[PDB]
């Protein structure tokens, strides 16, 4: 079994490091004064970057891999996506959900993602997707720790037996309580749904992740209730507000007032760059707003924010390979976090900040933690992001669970020359 990771670079640290492994955990981390020789039981990072696993804080595995079945969304709109999904209803079975969820999970394993939070639609009396996902969670456990959010897609108060189904999902084992206040029939139902959501989370000791204000409506301010209730219950760490795209459209004075509460509450925020840029701003003609939440300002204020892929190869987002560096690339551009340091520190948005959002207790390259880490063939976060590098090795419990042999590019000039896209 592997005993050491050598010649490792670490974010924010100078030089090379050696990570000692014992009994599936990191026993010690020591600096090196030079390059160490390879040997049996040593995994050579080759001066590449070693980081804790990538995290997917927000994805919908119940709808993944269904784009084009039976027809393609040709307009690319949300409306048509709903219709295309409805045409596939006859194929939505227990086995179908498991098969598609596993397909995307395999892409995630290949992409060094060892933690995934999936939302599952529970506005279905049969809870078909949920039952399937609970089995998938057990099956994929050796490679990925999967959290399941009971997501009442059609609303809690605006759908028949919505609250009862949400609670049933928790009784069956869902890890997180979801909600969608802006989709409820009225603002009052929206606020009330949040009180019910928090009551359920406290009753069952579960986390909370609300699809919050995902709409270009400057009056959609459910985020203040999410933050206020979290602060009241002293449970900010266990709470997440996903999307909050409406915040992109708030006036600055209200946003400034709100930010004080957001910081005090300690809640987490998830932005989904690939889907937000695609689905937001659809009611604008020109100019067209970007529609991503205030990521830059959150970072400047010390508010925890991270990035999710949201959807992969489905009616609402036809693209994706479940790659977090790709999600990060889109977010840095749309949020204008393009300074060198902002880009370099970007890795935090798909690693540490996301681990905090999932309330993970065993995460990070530190003595005592499980030996879960990945190796990127790049010098730092900036380099990894610029070159969209693959994951050279993914290690879990001190064992390699994924590896990618890099592509080899050659140009034939007066003489053949290898191209690695580095200067």
Asked if 272 interacts with a copy of itself (CB under 8 A), we say no
Selected binder of a copy of itself within 256, 301, 336, 388 (CB under 8 A): 256
- CB neighbourhood size of 415 (10 A): 6
State yes or no: 107 annotated in a binding site.
Answer: no
State yes or no: 362 annotated in a binding site.
Answer: no
State yes or no: 60 annotated in a binding site.
Answer: yes
Asked if 225 interacts with a copy of itself (CB under 8 A), we say yes
Asked if 217 interacts with a copy of itself (CB under 8 A), we say yes
Asked if 221 interacts with a copy of itself (CB under 8 A), we say yes
What is the token pair recorded at 194?
Answer: 């949040």
Selected binder of a copy of itself within 283, 367, 399, 403 (CB under 8 A): 283
Asked if 189 interacts with a copy of itself (CB under 8 A), we say yes
State yes or no: 147 annotated in a binding site.
Answer: no
Give the β-pairing of 393-396 and 54-59: unpaired
Selected binder of a copy of itself within 20, 88, 106, 231 (CB under 8 A): 231
Let me know: does 111 contact 322? Beta carbons within 8 Å. Answer: yes
CA distance 358 to 116: 9
Considering only residues 132 to 171 of the shown chain, the ones binding a copy of itself according to CB under 8 A are 158
Toward a copy of itself, which CB reaches closer, 255 or 404? 255
Rounded (10°) CA dihedral 202, 205, 207, 211: -40
Give the helix ranges, DSSP H, for 76-186.
Answer: 78-86, 94-110, 128-140, 162-171
Asked if 421 interacts with a copy of itself (CB under 8 A), we say no
Q: How far is the CB of 341 from a copy of itself (least distance, A)?
A: 23
Let me know: does 178 contact 210? Beta carbons within 8 Å. Answer: yes
Active site residue 224: no
Sheet holding 49-51, edge to edge: 49-51, 373-376, 393-396, 399-403
Selected binder of a copy of itself within 46, 139, 163, 218 (CB under 8 A): 218
252 φ, ψ (degrees, to nearest 5): -65, -30
Q: Which helix (H) or strand (E) holds 18?
A: strand 16-22
Toward a copy of itself, which CB reaches closer, 126 or 186? 186
Asked if 20 interacts with a copy of itself (CB under 8 A), we say no
Let me know: does 51 contact 352? Beta carbons within 8 Å. Answer: no
List contacts with a copy of itself (CB under 8 A). Answer: 158, 182-183, 185-189, 191, 215-221, 224-225, 227-228, 231, 251-257, 261, 282-284
- Residues belonging to the binding site are 58, 60, 153, 211, 310, 316
């Amino acid at each position: 079994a592997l005993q050491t990771i050598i010649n490792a670079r670490l974010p924010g640290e100078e030089g090379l490091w050696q990570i000692h492994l014992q009994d599936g955990k990191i026993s010690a981390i020591d600096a090196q004064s030079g390059v160490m020789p390879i040997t049996e039981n040593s995994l050579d990072a080759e001066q590449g970057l070693v980081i804790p696993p990538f995290v997917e804080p927000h994805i919908h595995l119940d709808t993944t891999q269904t784009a084009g079945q039976p027809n393609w969304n040709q307009s690319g709109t949300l409306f048509e996506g709903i219709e295309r999904w409805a045409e596939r209803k006859a194929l939505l079975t227990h086995d179908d959900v498991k098969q598609r969820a596993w397909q995307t999970l395999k892409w995630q394993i290949a992409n060094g993602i060892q933690h995934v939070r999936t939302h599952v639609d529970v506005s279905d009396a049969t809870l078909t997707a949920l039952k399937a996902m609970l089995e998938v969670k057990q099956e994929v456990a050796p490679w990925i720790d999967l959290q399941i959010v009971a997501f009442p897609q059609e609303g809690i108060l605006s759908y028949p037996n919505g609250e009862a189904l949400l609670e049933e999902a928790l009784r069956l084992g869902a890890d997180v309580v979801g909600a969608i206040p802006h989709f409820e029939f009225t603002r009052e139902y929206g606020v009330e749904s949040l009180h019910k959501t928090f009551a359920l989370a406290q009753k069952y000791d579960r986390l909370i992740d609300v699809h919050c204000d995902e709409i270009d409506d400057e009056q959609s301010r459910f985020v203040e209730t999410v933050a206020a209730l979290a602060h009241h219950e002293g449970m900010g760490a266990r709470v997440t507000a996903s999307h909050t795209t409406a915040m992109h459209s708030y006036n600055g004075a209200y946003t400034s007032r709100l930010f004080r509460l957001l910081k005090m509450s300690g809640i987490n925020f998830v932005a989904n760059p690939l889907v937000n840029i695609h689905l937001q701003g659809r009611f604008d003609t020109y100019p067209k707003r970007r529609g991503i939440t205030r990521v830059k300002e959150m970072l400047e204020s010390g508010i925890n924010v991270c990035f999710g892929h949201d959807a992969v190869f489905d009616p609402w987002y036809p693209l994706g390979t479940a790659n977090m560096l790709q999600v990060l690339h889109m977010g840095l551009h749309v949020c204008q976090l393009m300074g060198y340091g902002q880009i370099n520190d970007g890795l935090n948005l798909i690693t540490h900040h996301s681990a905090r959002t999932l309330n993970l207790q065993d995460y990070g390259i530190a003595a005592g933690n499980s030996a879960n880490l990945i190796i990127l063939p790049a010098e730092n976060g900036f380099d990894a992001l610029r070159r969209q590098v693959p994951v050279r090795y993914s290690v879990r419990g001190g064992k390699v669970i994924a590896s990618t042999q890099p592509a080899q590019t050659t140009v034939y000039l007066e003489q053949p020359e290898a191209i690695d896209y580095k200067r």
